[PDB]
Swiss-Prot record, chains A, C:
Family membership noted in the UniProt record: Belongs to the CarB family.
Summary of the function given for this chain in its UniProt record: Large subunit of the glutamine-dependent carbamoyl phosphate synthetase (CPSase). CPSase catalyzes the formation of carbamoyl phosphate from the ammonia moiety of glutamine, carbonate, and phosphate donated by ATP, constituting the first step of 2 biosynthetic pathways, one leading to arginine and/or urea and the other to pyrimidine nucleotides.
UniProt binding sites for ATP 2: R357
Protein name: Carbamoyl phosphate synthase large chain
Domain notes: The large subunit is composed of 2 ATP-grasp domains that are involved in binding the 2 ATP molecules needed for carbamoyl phosphate synthesis. The N-terminal ATP-grasp domain (referred to as the carboxyphosphate synthetic component) catalyzes the ATP-dependent phosphorylation of hydrogencarbonate to carboxyphosphate and the subsequent nucleophilic attack by ammonia to form a carbamate intermediate.
Curated annotation (Swiss-Prot), chains B, D:
Top EC class, one word: ligase
Gene: carA
Listed Pfam families: CPSase_sm_chain (PF00988), GATase (PF00117)
Source organism per UniProt: Escherichia coli O157:H7
GO molecular function (one): carbamoyl-phosphate synthase (glutamine-hydrolyzing) activity
Pathway assigned to this chain's UniProt record: Amino-acid biosynthesis; L-arginine biosynthesis; carbamoyl phosphate from bicarbonate: step 1/1; Pyrimidine metabolism; UMP biosynthesis via de novo pathway; (S)-dihydroorotate from bicarbonate: step 1/3
Function field: Small subunit of the glutamine-dependent carbamoyl phosphate synthetase (CPSase). CPSase catalyzes the formation of carbamoyl phosphate from the ammonia moiety of glutamine, carbonate, and phosphate donated by ATP, constituting the first step of 2 biosynthetic pathways, one leading to arginine and/or urea and the other to pyrimidine nucleotides. The small subunit (glutamine amidotransferase) binds and cleaves glutamine to supply the large subunit with the substrate ammonia.
Domain Glutamine amidotransferase type-1, residue spans: 192-375
Name under which the protein is recorded: Carbamoyl phosphate synthase small chain
NCBIfam families, per the entry: CPSaseIIsmall, PRK12838.1
Assembly and oligomerization: Composed of two chains; the small (or glutamine) chain promotes the hydrolysis of glutamine to ammonia, which is used by the large (or ammonia) chain to synthesize carbamoyl phosphate. Tetramer of heterodimers (alpha,beta)4.
Binding-site residues, L-glutamine: S46, G240, G242, L269, Q272, N310, G312, F313
CPSase, as annotated region: 1-188
Catalytic activity, reaction form: hydrogencarbonate + L-glutamine + 2 ATP + H2O = carbamoyl phosphate + L-glutamate + 2 ADP + phosphate + 2 H(+)
Catalytic residue list: C268 (nucleophile), H352, E354
UniProt lineage: Bacteria, Pseudomonadati, Pseudomonadota, Gammaproteobacteria, Enterobacterales
């Protein structure tokens, strides 16, 4: 799935056409189309957890917006395809507007009906059989969480409870006709696992950044690759986690074990669960891994280097000012306004010109 | 819930869903790596008594149609797959997979870890298995049945699939534009080839016709005398299921031809027969060759062909008589894929040739036919 | 099907609710729901020929308008349902918004599909087998005509050609278990005709006015009845044509033969075809029959009483003005403007106040 | 285009569309005016060997469901309807009508002029006929079978729909709420009733149990001797197909009981037998009674009942034995509908009783079984 950055482009026509406008891409592997697609969605680094809705069910205007989005595609179409199903549109309906093969549409439609049940039954209706069926369809804990009205951790808890975890298959070029000595894996909900992790060494896991986007480029990938080459050479078992098809970090040669996965909490936790690595680097893949840092740590992950908390100390404008202060250093005049008049007042204090950061 | 179950000789179980007829199925379990062509595989006589597992997860994406039928019927004993699509999506489809399976009374199962099954067959070799589909599938029953299965080793399957009476075939290849062509008329074909039906596929026949051959399809047991009586321009030995060895009938016949100067061409089972009749020995493969990306080297030419394989036995190179020159070998496993008689106009190929419509095998055959009529 | 008059009511809430707002109703009899329904549609006297479209296929807002009409029924909902299907809504989608049982909606949907095939094949795709199938689904000559881009008459000719006419069944309370002596009939496209017109008497056909509407009430029905009773008494064989279920006109006692049908050129002609009446009175049923006068005559129907042209003489604002002229009588100053500026002028001539008639 | 066709003895043809199994069907053609309850009609034994035409155009609006089977299976020979609905739309539906027809393998045609058929049957009388559903239905063939059909006059159908061995029935009537109730406990039922399965309808049974009747379902032949051997509180003779006359086996029996002081209650077929056994004669109706809007008078009370009717023969009123009192008559045709022995605890009803939770009849019955045990 391509990755766009229209939000950074004011005045830009944002409809998709023959001239590329995407800034990157994400890849996913799954045992079924459905699983594959949803995994890609949650790994797109756009805040999605699957088919999250774009328009409300009560907006009497929805059908209109939806139609438009389907007929003349933008970066958001896939989500509007699901909202169309939610809104009453037929598979033929959708087809006529998008020309996207029904083979794909029927599958999106099915996910939608499934989301509806989820919604209907709530967490309470999430028994092991159903939940497994969901997971197999590639549903994220997060997306499920949302439908059921609970936190993501809740779904995850439930899985733990049911011992509902994915298995890892390997990429081999040959549909398993010949064995592989390489460890290029993807998760799925099936029977047999091929992870076969080593008990032998000290493992280091490196988290990549997902698809590239503006400000989150190859520079980070570069760093991630480097961590791996270095630590490997030094004798660590290096594990790379990423899902950008364009990069060297996703080259099997780059590391000992490669997990071509969404760089999310859910996905990262599963691997950790089984790899039981010595350390995890979250500082080299950009914002993506950075943001995962606290939850990972909290979930028991042996995060190495600069601590989540320290990173937060620096990132957090308030916590931070306080450091600057502490060290008696020079920071530009600042204020935290809430209301307009408030800001005009404070502005006065601070002094123009000003930098207005949301 | 429509349950289904598959159980291996060894006790391995795979729980899933029924997508074909109700009931049970037993046979030797194989995996096929083809990403496309499921229909053709199902309807290939080469799969008689076999339980076909497809490694490609979504099977049934394009539904089915008559033109994609390799024989008058489904030869696979059962079908085992990972996912049956919600819909068939293709202009050529005339009936979805599931309905098709049912119409043909095939027991099929979906939703199981085909990868694990594949890796098991790969690692431990083929195994007999049984699939049961219905209300409350009995795993013990399944296991019993699987274990009880006699097995393909030493089993003559060709006599099972061959036609009962002889008959003509003058229908050529399919085209996108006009589908399957009308059958040609006899004065419309220069050559007359006698083809032994050891469970032959429609596409080979169609190919031969494409090349000028009027064909007379004969039962597997047909005597050499009976045939020779027809003054054949060439003799063709089809592909087919099971073990070649117990095909006493064929070997005998073939030897006769081999005394003669009549060009003889064999594919797959035919190739094995030809080899047997030439004094070679056949073996049964760990798991076989079932797919459509198998690299084979033409040793003579030093070129690689990407082929279709559908076999579980093979000709042992080490016992190759000296009147048998090796022409092709598997780049996957080094196994024998081609041979030619150094003393006779007879050659054969292990894999299953297809139409473009480089046809070197075919063209050779045709070539030999001509020389033969030139005489 | 109920008959409304919201156009006469400016400011009136026009959504349907628990308080009745219709002014009349129409009834139809068919051998199937589709037949029945479409027949009722074309007999409703609202200018419909069946599921005539209310919103354009190419309107970007059409899904929305469609949604509203569907969710909050108005007099036109029946049309918007077809429109929904045209626009790509699914049967389930329509159901969610209207709560109309799917058994019904599916039938509307099928109708729409067939319509689409017509549209596609054109007059040329109208072979005998297909035409017959359409006529059995209640398709009106007129409706097919719009779809195929031809005159209603063309379709009519087409059927003539194919010897494609309806048959007449009788009402009998008992599903044909017992014979009837009454001639209460309805049209359908089937095998056996039960019409068995008499060759005996002189037949007089009285055309009713369909469902009641404001300005087209019982007063006309009263007349229709009188015509019958009268002539019948006189010894003529009276034949009523009407489809308003509330009236005395539709009572089998009121006449010799009753054809419970839509008062359309199409339906009438089919009766005439087999009845071959001495005459046909078109002046007693109000506006409905009136407007068919010309066409009926033109089709060779034996219109008695004041002539259709005559009628035309008096209805025609100009035709009339001339005769008023002719007679040397007093009519109010009048003018026929097209343009505003043109009016204000003529206006000055004529002189306020003024009666502006579109 | 799935053609089908119906042809009458008379040569009358009805062209339509196949909506059931493929194949041919033959029997007597009857018409049923029930606007609802098609499943129930199809599963009524009273229809064996009869091809059923439904006057009500849309058949299948509510699909089907097990709670709606009046017997173990569909007895109707074929089904003739005007329109098979696009979908079934009811909360009780478990399977569309078309699919239902197939699984049960019923030849069936939709889209014909059922009115035309009705009037013909009404005017000219019942007729044997043949439905042929297939690729190119043969009119002559269908006529050929139609004419060939033996016919129900003088046909024992009861012996064809009865059960092999006897059995117990303790199930009551359905409720919207609970549905099909569990089967009561032997010790939970005051009375013991024996019922001769002349091809008996489930509901009727259900109605007895409802009344406190334990039930023993026996085969048709069943000897009075063997019966009396179970000390039954009352005997019940069920409804069933064909002609009653040829059922020598029961008239006999019945007559036994008829010397006894055991109460005997007859329905439909069993009302006919009673009659015979008591000396009356039975005729075959022009078209019979089939539907659910039939008015019947309880002469005694001078009140009218709206009943369900499924019969082709009746009891001739003119040939009544004094010991046979007329209890009911059809307000449609003045035909016989109910009788009571002047001299015995026996009475029967032509029509088919139904639960609200006939009650009179049914109650009488019990009130007889009661007065009988009181003694
Ligand atoms: Cl569930
Ligand atoms: Cl499995
Ligand atoms: Cl041929
Ligand atoms: Cl109002
Ligand atoms: Cl057509
Ligand atoms: Cl017909
Ligand atoms: K920053
Ligand atoms: K499974």
């Amino acid at each position: 799935i391509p990755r766009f950055n229209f939000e950074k482009f004011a005045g830009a026509n944002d409809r998709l056409t023959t001239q590329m406008k995407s800034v990157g891409e994400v890849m996913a592997i799954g045992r079924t189309q459905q699983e594959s697609l949803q995994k890609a969605l949650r790994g797109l680094e756009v805040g999605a957890t699957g088919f999250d809705p774009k328009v409300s069910l009560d907006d009497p205007e929805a059908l209109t917006k939806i139609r438009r989005e389907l007929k003349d595609a933008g970066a958001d179409r896939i989500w509007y395809i699901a909202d169309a199903f939610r809104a009453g549109l037929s598979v033929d309906g959708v087809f006529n507007l998008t020309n996207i093969d029904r083979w794909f549409l029927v599958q999106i439609e099915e996910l939608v009906r499934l989301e509806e049940k989820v919604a209907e039954v709530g967490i309470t209706g999430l028994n092991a059989d159903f939940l497994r069926q969901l997971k197999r369809k590639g549903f994220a804990d997060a997306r499920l969480a949302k439908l059921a009205g609970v936190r993501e951790a809740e779904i995850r808890k439930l899985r733990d409870q049911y011992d509902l975890h994915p298995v890892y298959k390997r990429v081999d070029t040959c549909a398993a006709e010949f064995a592989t000595d390489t460890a290029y894996m993807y998760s799925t909900y099936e029977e047999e696992c091929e992870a076969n992790p080593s008990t032998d060494r000290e493992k280091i896991m490196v988290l990549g950044g997902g698809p590239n986007r503006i400000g989150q480029g190859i520079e980070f990938d570069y760093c991630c690759v480097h961590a791996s080459l270095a630590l490997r050479e030094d004798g660590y078992e290096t594990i790379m986690v990423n899902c950008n098809p364009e990069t060297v970090s996703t080259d099997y040669d780059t590391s000992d074990r490669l997990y071509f996965e969404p760089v999310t909490l859910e996905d990262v936790l599963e691997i950790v669960r089984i790899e039981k690595p010595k350390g995890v680097i979250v500082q080299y893949g950009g914002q993506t891994p950075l943001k995962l840092a606290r939850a990972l740590e909290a979930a028991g992950v042996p995060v190495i280097g600069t601590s989540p908390d320290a990173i937060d100390r620096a990132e957090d404008r308030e916590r931070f000012q306080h450091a600057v202060e502490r060290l008696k250093l020079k920071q530009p005049a600042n204020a935290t306004v809430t209301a307009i008049e408030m800001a005009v007042e404070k502005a006065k204090e601070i002094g123009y010109p000003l930098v207005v950061r949301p | 819930i429509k349950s289904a179950l598959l159980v291996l000789e060894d006790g391995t179980q795979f729980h899933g869903r029924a997508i074909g007829a109700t009931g049970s199925a037993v046979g030797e379990v194989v995996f096929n790596t083809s990403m496309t062509g499921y229909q053709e595989i199902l309807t290939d006589p080469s799969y008689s008594r076999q339980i076909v597992t497809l490694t490609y997860p979504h099977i049934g994406n394009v539904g089915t149609n008559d033109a994609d039928e390799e024989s008058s019927q489904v030869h696979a004993q059962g079908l085992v797959i990972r996912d049956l699509p919600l819909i068939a999506s293709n202009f050529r489809n005339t009936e979805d997979l599931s309905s098709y399976l049912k119409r043909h009374n095939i027991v099929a199962i979906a939703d199981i870890d085909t990868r694990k099954l594949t890796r098991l067959l790969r690692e431990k070799g083929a195994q007999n298995g049984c699939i049961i589909a219905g209300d409350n599938p009995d795993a013990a029953l399944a296991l019993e049945k699987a274990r009880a299965f006699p097995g393909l080793n030493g089993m003559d399957l060709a006599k099972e699939v061959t036609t009962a009476e002889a008959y003509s075939w003058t229908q050529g290849s399919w085209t996108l534009t006009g589908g399957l062509p009308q059958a040609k008329k006899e004065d419309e074909l220069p050559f007359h080839v006698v083809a032994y039906d050891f469970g032959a596929k429609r596409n080979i026949l169609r190919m031969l016709v494409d090349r000028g051959c009027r064909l007379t399809i004969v039962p597997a047991q047909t005597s050499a005398e009976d045939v020779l009586k027809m003054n054949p321009d060439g003799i063709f030995l089809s592909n087919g299921p099971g073990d070649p060895a117990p095909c006493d009938y064929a070997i005998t016949a073939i030897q006769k031809f081999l005394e003669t100067d009549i060009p003889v061409f064999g594919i797959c089972l035919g190739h094995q027969l030809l080899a047997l009749a030439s004094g070679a020995k056949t073996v049964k493969m760990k798991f076989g060759h079932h797919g459509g990306n198998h690299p084979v080297k033409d040793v003579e030419k030093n070129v690689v062909m990407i082929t279709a394989q559908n076999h579980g036995f093979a000709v042992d190179e080490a016992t190759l008589p000296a009147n048998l020159r090796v022409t092709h070998k598997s780049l996957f496993d080094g196994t024998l894929q081609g041979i030619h008689r150094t003393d006779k106009p007879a050659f054969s190929f292990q894999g299953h040739p297809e139409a473009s419509p480089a046809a070197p095998l075919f063209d050779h055959f045709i070539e030999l036919i001509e020389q033969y009529r030139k005489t």
